[PDB]
Design a protein around this nucleic acid. Structure first.
Ligand SMILES: *[C@@H]1O[C@H](CO)[C@@H](O)[C@H](O)[C@H]1NC(C)=O
Ligand SMILES: *[C@@H]1O[C@H](CO)[C@@H](O)[C@H](O)[C@H]1NC(C)=O
Ligand SMILES: *[C@@H]1O[C@H](CO)[C@@H](O)[C@H](O)[C@H]1NC(C)=O
Ligand SMILES: *[C@@H]1O[C@H](CO)[C@@H](O)[C@H](O)[C@H]1NC(C)=O
Ligand SMILES: *[C@@H]1O[C@H](CO)[C@@H](O)[C@H](O)[C@H]1NC(C)=O
Ligand SMILES: *[C@@H]1O[C@H](CO)[C@@H](O)[C@H](O)[C@H]1NC(C)=O
Ligand SMILES: *[C@@H]1O[C@H](CO)[C@@H](O)[C@H](O)[C@H]1NC(C)=O
Ligand SMILES: *[C@@H]1O[C@H](CO)[C@@H](O)[C@H](O)[C@H]1NC(C)=O
Ligand SMILES: *[C@@H]1O[C@H](CO)[C@@H](O)[C@H](O)[C@H]1NC(C)=O
Ligand SMILES: *[C@@H]1O[C@H](CO)[C@@H](O)[C@H](O)[C@H]1NC(C)=O
Lengths: 732, 738
DNA sequence: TCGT
DNA sequence: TCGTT
DNA sequence: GGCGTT
DNA sequence: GGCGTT
């Protein structure tokens, strides 16, 4: 048997008891190797009471997760109140414990904890008071999280109280988080060891040097969202009061090690120069959701922030307005360490050579985020002069892998016809995203002429008219072309289309024609020497193959094709005819979510290199009508989510090379070894879950091959008899 | 028991044996009232052999459908060959038989048939020869169908042979259809009684008066697709040979009663005036898929077609080209009986005052079809001057500038065009317009009340599948009569993370009754409260009310202000939970609530008390495991309850009892093991629909539920075939009456 | 099947 | 939450 | 106490 | 003879 039923043993002594609806902590059998357990996860069970005996026998337990077990009223889906009781020696009985998560539990005080504890989450609990006695002897504690104990989702009448010097005994505390606690001031006398202090979304409306006293090791400080602009809030929000916030000039001046500072959503119309005196080595500055729209056009403060790597200016928009132009201050020219600049959501209508003048010669600038700005005029040629750009986001505007390569995102804009003069000075560009535009154009080879280095072009969710024979031929390096969800042209009854351009793309490897509703009046034969993968899912190959033999050889000419996706093609039948005229190079064939109630298994002989077959989500009633044929090179077979009620003995036997097999979500009543014969030893994945198994033969088979059966402990389920229906096969 | 198991008795003596996989015709029990059967449907069974005994006891059988029983190789899904044998007195033993369908069966000759036969389908069979002997004594036969016996889907080596005068003995034959038979000429000496003759998609490449000799009663004639233009074909197609077709001037001149004539796909570059001489009654003329693009600009032939009601000129396009303009001949102003003119697929780029000049004064013209033309400039103001237009189709074009039925009202379809911003000057002179379709365009615009100003009579506006920015407070306020507004599938703006939206315009539309905000993905940063005095129905399906209701109490009263709302659709809203909170703050006027395809695994049934006027509740496609946790509450006025496609495994006794007014109940596609009368109590007599199909019912010997379902059999749909066993195996997936 |  | 205040 | 994959 | 809602 598996050792820790009803939970699952994972590698490295990791026990998973998540989502088992347990009312108390399982102590397991004494025959189980309890000392081997280093991690115990009990996420989202119904344990409302913990006891001295619950973890004592787990001699080497290091991580313990009791999250979501007894959620407070506001966080409960049904608003059920919950109070969790904990006996005094519950966690003291585990002197090896290093990581404890008690979040989303209705506890009202901190329990007694062992001196070994390194990490502690008390977030989203009912603890309203922290004090000196609560953290006695916890000298190893590095991380303390207690977010969300007083806000709209987990309310309290007043606020979280952190007693002065309550945490001061925690000598090794580096990370402290106290967000969403209704705090009106920074807690007094925090540990000097802190490098990360997070106080965001409280109402700390004034600051001063004494509020951050003796915190000279501080590397990251988040005091953002403490007096907010609720015109931008998606959640409940109190408006920043008039004449606030009030930050004393010298508030941050003693924080010499500070790398990151978050001042987002603090209703700031300007910055004080004094705040950043002594923060010359600041690397990250978040100024998002403020009112700095005018400040950034004229400020001189970036001359003193020369080490800055990331600068977030996003959603610094003026209420009720967008600007005609937005010209950045000259001082941005001094940010020579700058790698990432976020300018999304400022709202401005024109992007010109003046806009980003100051940034043009910054030697290390890689990312530039200009999305969601209502830009309707964009001079795209400006980006050619930049020395180091890898990513420009101009998505979600009104203009009319690709990791580590120069990529331009123009998705979700109002482009209707592409003109080549758009792309002048962008010959270095390797990836271009034009998805979710409105491009309806008989594209013909004169649209992308300047893009001589382009390897990836995403034109999904457009209305492109595939007709002219030289489409995309002006892109010599083009390797990947996404033309999915351009269905509207293919729904024009009586107006046909031409896909002969595919043959003229000499280095194309990936093509998607997915979800186009291709059903009639189209080229009879696709061809390509280069193409490796074609996604043709979400079309009507059914209708096409019903038009006599017009489309019998539609894929034939893709003579080096390795992957073909024919999922969601309304296919009720699939003949030897059709499979024989697929390219003989084919290794992976996907046929998910078709209408196949029958499949001639002997016809798989015609696909000599087929390794992976996906028939998931069809309506097969059985695995019979001839077995899998001899000499087949098949490795993966997915027949899950069918209605398979029985399997002929010796069905899988002849598939020597078979490795993965998914029989899940079927109508199987048993799991018989005669189906696989010799394959039972060779198989590495045998999914048999979500089947109505008759629980009274199969248990000894599954236990013998238990390493190959995923979710054996919990997911492999009985269908009969009642009393065991829907429950694990090991409940008896 | 139901009388004709395993088939179903329907009203009017109609027995349905379709799709039962029967290898022979069922004779039924002798206790069954065999004489009551007037219609027997056996569609798509596996009956390859018919016998003298099969229908003899059906003394009053009038209709018999044996379609798809033994499909020929080409029509078989797996290309299995099939030959159907028929004993001599199979149909003679039914002397009352009037309607016989033998289509999609591999028969090679016509069987012996009773003299009572009125209608006969031999379409898609293996009959390659019709002859004099085949129709002996069939004097009552009015309809003969035999389409598709020689073409790509049902091939023969040569063609269907119709012997001269083979059908001449059929004295009452009115309708004859012989499409897709590879015929090279009209069959000789057809019956003079014919009013409808259909010969489309053969290869009758020449015609003459003698080909249609003595057919003076002919009302409809289809000779279209007989020499085709395969550049437009979606199916296998042979090109019209050079110098063809060859129609003699006087071919149709003796057909005085002809109302409809189909000359589509005949590769005609012009018409002959002589063809229409003596066609004084001609009401319908189909000229589609020809090469008449130049002919229609200058022809004078429409001066002699003054009785014509429908004229189809669609797909008269010039190969490889579209035209800059298209100016119709002056003679179109002469078609004074014309009601419908179809001009889709000609391909022309500009629509002006000149284009349709000739049509402007035609007094009865209702429909004008200009779709699929690649038009990029359209002067829409021209349509105001027309006296009788009800429908103008300008859909699927390239135009970019200057729900109630709409069937009997002036409607303009501009859907599937390239409009990005709407300018009011588009709609000048269209103040009479009552319905406007702008769906599947690319409209991305902060619409604000200055876009539709001329449309003073507009009641219905479809803006679905666009990218409209709902923000300004006066959107659509310039439409005073606006009753129905579809803003569904405008989701992209609502996916702009951090850019919020404003739906306060809904309150400013004083006569709005229907609104759709469906499939918009509305999830955050939106107006907290919708309001309207007038609104009756709101489709809010396909959004994330789940996310909205998870933001504290911001959207707690989101629907509250719709104070006269009768229908609310909250389907596909990702709702895992549904509290008393949320239902209490819906409008108390609400009568129909739809919650299909949400994520509801639990439902507090007692909270239905808070919706006092609720009559229809749709919870189909959720994940309810049982009907329990309190029963339906007392005084509930509920009439329809749909909890189908859940995982309901049991029902607490007395669950439905308190719902006095309950009429329809859908429990189908669940995990129910029985059907217990204690669930309903007194309701069992009251219920009019009780769907219990696709449930894994436990069919034990003397199972409780069979006597309950039989007692209430009029209320249970698909009882004969669809009500199914789940256990034990050997009965699994089969009928409860096996 | 979209200015040959 | 998009030329206001 | 029930609810739910956050 | 089997397949399949045409
Ligand atoms: C937070 O503090 C305010 C002001 O003292 C108080 O009114 C409110 O009740 C407190 N709690 C919450 C959950 O907002
Ligand atoms: C920006 O582009 C314009 C138009 O080509 C040009 O006149 C101007 O010199 C360019 N540079 C600057 C710094 O304005
Ligand atoms: C695309 O169309 C334009 C306009 O007709 C033409 O000038 C151009 O040569 C075409 N491009 C190609 C590559 O044929
Ligand atoms: C598709 O285009 C190519 C080249 O433009 C042409 O040779 C081919 O015949 C076209 N297809 C059809 C169906 O006309
Ligand atoms: C099954 O496939 C084999 C081999 O391709 C072929 O001989 C046979 O005709 C097929 N049978 C059916 C029923 O389709
Ligand atoms: C139709 O007849 C032609 C010529 O008489 C012949 O070539 C062909 O075999 C027939 N076509 C079909 C589809 O039966
Ligand atoms: C259409 O007209 C009919 C009768 O004239 C009327 O019943 C109906 O209300 C009208 N519908 C619209 C949407 O204008
Ligand atoms: C709508 O917006 C346009 C452009 O900003 C403006 O001209 C017009 O006055 C606005 N309409 C109304 C009704 O205010
Ligand atoms: C929506 O617009 C109305 C009037 O234009 C305004 O009163 C209301 O505050 C707006 N909604 C939001 C969320 O600002
Ligand atoms: C009950 O629901 C099913 C789908 O779940 C549907 O097929 C059926 O039509 C419904 N019953 C009635 C009587 O309409």
């Amino acid at each position: 048997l598996p050792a820790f039923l009803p939970c699952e043993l994972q590698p490295h002594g990791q026990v998973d008891c998540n989502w088992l609806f347990l009312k108390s902590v399982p102590h397991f059998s004494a025959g189980a190797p309890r000392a081997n357990v280093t991690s115990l996860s009990l996420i989202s069970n119904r344990i409302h009471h913990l006891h001295d005996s619950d973890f004592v026998h787990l001699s080497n337990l290091r991580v313990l997760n009791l999250k979501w077990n007894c959620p407070p009223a506001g966080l409960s889906p049904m608003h059920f109140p919950c109070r969790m009781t904990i006996e005094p020696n519950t966690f003291l009985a585990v002197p090896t414990l290093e990581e404890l998560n008690l979040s989303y539990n209705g506890i009202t005080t901190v329990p007694a904890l062992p001196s070994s504890l390194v990490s502690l989450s008390l977030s989203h609990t009912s603890i309203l008071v922290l004090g000196p006695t609560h953290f006695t002897g916890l000298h190893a504690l590095r991380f303390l999280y207690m977010d969300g104990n007083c806000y709209y989702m987990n309310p309290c009448p007043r606020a979280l109280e952190v007693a002065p010097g309550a945490l001061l005994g925690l000598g090794n505390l580096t990370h402290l988080s106290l967000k969403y606690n209704n705090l009106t001031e920074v807690p007094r006398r925090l540990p000097p060891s802190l490098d990360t202090l997070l106080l965001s979304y409280n109402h700390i409306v004034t600051l001063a040097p004494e509020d951050l006293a003796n915190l000279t090791a501080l590397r990251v400080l988040d005091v953002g969202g403490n007096c907010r602009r609720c015109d931008h809030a998606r959640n409940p929000c109190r408006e920043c009061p008039k004449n606030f916030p009030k930050l004393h000039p010298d508030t941050f001046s003693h924080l010499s090690r500070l790398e990151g500072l978050v001042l987002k959503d603090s209703s700031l119309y300007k910055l004080e120069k004094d705040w950043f005196r002594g923060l010359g080595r600041l690397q990250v500055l978040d100024l998002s959701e403020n009112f700095l729209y005018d400040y950034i056009t004229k400020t001189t403060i970036f001359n003193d922030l020369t080490q800055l790597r990331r600068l977030n200016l996003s959603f610094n928009y003026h209420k009720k307005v967008s600007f005609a132009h937005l010209h950045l201050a000259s001082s941005f020219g001094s940010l020579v360490s700058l790698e990432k600049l976020d300018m999304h959501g400022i709202f401005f209508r024109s992007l010109t050579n003046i806009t980003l003048q100051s940034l043009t010669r910054l030697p290390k600038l890689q990312s530039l985020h200009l999305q969601l700005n209502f830009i309707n005029q964009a001079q795209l040629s400006i980006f050619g002069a930049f020395p180091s750009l890898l990513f420009v986001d101009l998505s979600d505007n009104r203009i009319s892998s690709c990791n580590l390569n120069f990529t331009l995102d123009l998705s979700r804009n109002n482009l209707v016809t592409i003109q080549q003069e758009m792309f002048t000075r962008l010959s270095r560009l390797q990836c271009l995203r034009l998805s979710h535009n409105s491009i309806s154009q008989a594209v013909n080879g004169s649209q992308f002429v300047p893009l001589t280095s382009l390897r990836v072009l995403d034109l999904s969710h457009n209305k492109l008219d595939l007709y002219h024979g030289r489409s995309f031929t002006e892109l010599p390096q083009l390797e990947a072309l996404d033309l999915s969800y351009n269905s509207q042209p293919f729904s024009m009854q009586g107006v046909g289309h031409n896909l002969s351009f595919v043959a003229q793309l000499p280095s194309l490897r990936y093509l998607s024609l997915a979800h186009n509703g291709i059903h009639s009046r189209v080229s009879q034969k696709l061809s390509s020497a280069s193409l490796r993968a074609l996604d043709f899912s979400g079309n009507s190959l059914s209708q096409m193959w019903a038009e006599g033999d017009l489309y019998l050889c539609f894929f034939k000419g893709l003579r080096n094709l390795v992957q073909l996706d024919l999922s969601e093609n309304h296919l009720h039948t699939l003949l030897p005819r059709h499979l024989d005229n697929l390219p003989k190079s084919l290794r992976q064939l996907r046929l998910r979510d078709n209408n196949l109630a029958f499949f001639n298994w002997s016809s798989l002989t015609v696909l000599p290199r087929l390794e992976a077959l996906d028939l998931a989500g069809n309506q097969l009633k059985a695995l019979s009508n001839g077995s899998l044929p001899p000499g087949i090179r098949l490795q993966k077979l997915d027949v899950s989510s069918n209605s398979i009620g029985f399997v002929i003995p010796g069905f899988f036997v002849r598939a020597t090379r078979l490795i993965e097999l998914n029989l899940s979500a079927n109508a199987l009543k048993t799991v018989d070894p005669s189906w696989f014969g010799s394959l039972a030893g060779t198989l590495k994945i045998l999914d048999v879950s979500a089947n109505p198994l008759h629980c009274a033969a199969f248990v000894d088979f599954l236990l013998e091959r238990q390493e190959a059966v995923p979710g054996l402990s919990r997911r492999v389920t009985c269908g009969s008899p009642g009393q065991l229906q829907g429950r694990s096969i090991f409940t008896q």
